[PDB]
Design a protein around this ligand. Sequence first.
Ligand SMILES: CC(C)(C)NC(=O)N1CCn2nc(-c3ccc(F)c(Cl)c3)c(C(N)=O)c2C1
Ligand SMILES: CC(C)(C)NC(=O)N1CCn2nc(-c3ccc(F)c(Cl)c3)c(C(N)=O)c2C1
Lengths: 290, 288
Amino acid sequence: VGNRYRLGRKIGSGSFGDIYLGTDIAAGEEVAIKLECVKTKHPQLHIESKIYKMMQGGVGIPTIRWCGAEGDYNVMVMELLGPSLEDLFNFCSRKFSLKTVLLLADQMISRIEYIHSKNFIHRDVKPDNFLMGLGKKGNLVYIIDFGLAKKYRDARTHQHIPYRENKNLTGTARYASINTHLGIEQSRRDDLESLGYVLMYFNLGSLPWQGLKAATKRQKYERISEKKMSTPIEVLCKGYPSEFATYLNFCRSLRFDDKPDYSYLRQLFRNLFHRQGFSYDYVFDWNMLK
Amino acid sequence: MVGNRYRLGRKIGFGDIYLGTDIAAGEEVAIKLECVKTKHPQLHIESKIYKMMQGGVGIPTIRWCGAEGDYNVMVMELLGPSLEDLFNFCSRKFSLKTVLLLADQMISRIEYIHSKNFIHRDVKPDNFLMGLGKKGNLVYIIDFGLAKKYRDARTHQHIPYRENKNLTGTARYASINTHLGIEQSRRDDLESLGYVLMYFNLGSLPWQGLKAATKRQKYERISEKKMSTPIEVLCKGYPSEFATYLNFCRSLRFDDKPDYSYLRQLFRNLFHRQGFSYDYVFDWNMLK
Ligand SMILES: CC(C)(C)NC(=O)N1CCn2nc(-c3ccc(F)c(Cl)c3)c(C(N)=O)c2C1
Ligand SMILES: CC(C)(C)NC(=O)N1CCn2nc(-c3ccc(F)c(Cl)c3)c(C(N)=O)c2C1
């Protein structure tokens, strides 16, 4: 955009707009650029940039270099990050070692806790929304995409949003909490339950509610909801360390406005990591690729 | 380039060049692919020249990967745009300050290659790249595909004078002796740089856009125009240092060692007299 940014390859899309790799010619830096049509009915890129700015300084929160307008677009320039966890799962033949799953789990719980500490819920916890850093930040898991994020409490009083029903499923149905499928207003517990499904997806290679055929989105979400509700946690997690089922049961037991015990959840996986005798070196499956 | 470690991205350019990602190291890189069954293999030969030059200021770091399927693969660290790309981004006009900042590094890059016993033989704006990030003020040199050893590493015995040589390289920037079929030596790399500097000053050289019946005839028309344009006419209206630089290069004997410091001093003194500051703010750093 303008005379400064050269747009490269389109690297897909997030919530509302296309994302490209690019070059900031003036600063001499490779970056990533998100474009929103300036005349869009529901503008949110500037709202999203202010969420990233409010979250700035938090571990694994990407830096926004610039957010403004150029031609027919609202533009947000982000620092260049590495592949998403879904990309890395594909590069690793859709199989992660237990050690890589546990290393990711620790950081993913912390990123969600941080967002919650800043009064927001993410509402779209999925592998594609966690990116590894590049270079010296290659061991750091970042969280992206605040397009569906919502404030769950007043920053001043900490008064929680009220319980609501008949809500539409926004987010990715594969990883949605059961309460989300049932139309309940999302809260802190839902971000963590979704992470529990992401962890089991990394363990299994797929979830048992994937690949269900449907003619419409509405039908597909119903089939996923029914399968997800009718699969006991102890069946879903069969043949994997008990910590994955304990984690999911804990999240599903939380009241709508409960504060999650994030340290208890990290400790489940940290204790398992120690019992397995794994080294604390941050060597992930993809670091072994030749 | 693949295997399981490198993901190929967009093609950016002896073979094709792609942006890519080293998944294992977590680094964005560039990857060059040469067909394994090519008639004239040169990628492995080029990789050894880069490795021998390693550690020199502005020499890119590489990794020879060998044969991966149907390709020979070479991975290079990720660099920024070439000077031709930046010239285009700057509307094919560079300020005198940007030309002088570039000249100092370009003379030193050629001197380094010469100190490592090679001549480059394809000095052109596309073969100089700026670095990215903390290396954004550094000019790198690339492409050793036409490079040749001009002297023995130990004895410094120079290669002999030869005639009837073919013009390899870019005709626009070739030295007059290159057009005349004379064996290239150190002087030729520096004369080519002199034309690159005047190309940045002018926006074009007076031997550009010449029409001809064949490429052979076009190269002859470029040669005729370069020989028929006195240095003082080519450089008219620009600081005398550009003409002094070109006259010096054209005065060198075939095996003479160039006085690189004399040439850098011409432009360093001019930069000081012009009252420019070493803030390293190039024309492209002002783009909005
Ligand atoms: C450098 C390679 C090609 C490995 N990186 C990626 O594949 N990416 C994953 C997908 N992805 N998505 C983003 C991204 C996410 C959200 C954004 F708003 C913006 Cl501007 C960029 C970014 C980023 N900041 O570099 C990336 C980076
Ligand atoms: C990051 C952006 C896209 C701005 N870079 C470029 O436009 N490039 C200029 C063109 N260019 N050419 C190369 C290059 C030259 C020679 C090589 F053998 C290899 Cl593998 C790469 C490279 C490199 N090492 O990054 C580049 C880099």
